[PDB]
């Protein structure tokens, strides 16, 4: 009703450590199929590259590398 759905849903983190993470990424990680459907139906981008520092492979330094893509995740 605020005609802002596209920008809100496809909004993402800004700090370098989680840069690129999108609510679709959180939905897929939380394993909520219903939320995946709900988000994508409302215009969620399915090509969001979660290219943060956390989502890259670094020895010792904590993180999980999955391919930075919702399909890859």
């Amino acid at each position: 009703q605020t005609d802002s759905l596209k920008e809100l849903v496809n909004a993402s983190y800004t700090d370098s450590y989680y840069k690129g993470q999108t609510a679709l990424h959180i939905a897929i990680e939380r394993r909520n199929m219903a939320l995946v459907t709900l988000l994508v139906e409302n215009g969620a981008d399915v090509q969001a590259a979660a290219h943060g520092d956390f989502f890259k492979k670094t020895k010792g330094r904590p993180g999980f590398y999955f391919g930075e893509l919702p399909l890859s995740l």
Binding site: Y18, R30, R31, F54, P62, F64
Partner: protein
């Protein structure tokens, strides 16, 4: 034999730690002081905690109980 060696090294570590000045010992505590949660009184539960990292490829679903929702 490996267990004996590890215990020998443990004794060495303890002796070395005990055999230095208080400045370095206080500068060399293990782990970090982290806000684990809340006491039943509701106050903050600060503890000296040691952090490990684990990987499980069978039971990821055990999402119950989590500090720091941000990784």
């Amino acid at each position: 034999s490996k267990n004996i060696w590890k215990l020998q090294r443990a004794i060495t570590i303890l002796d070395t730690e005990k055999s230095f000045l208080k400045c370095m010992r206080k500068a060399f505590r293990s782990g970090k002081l982290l806000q684990v949660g809340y006491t039943p009184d509701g106050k903050d539960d600060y503890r000296w905690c040691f952090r490990v990292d684990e990987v499980n490829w069978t039971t990821w679903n055990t999402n119950v109980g989590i500090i720091n929702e941000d990784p």
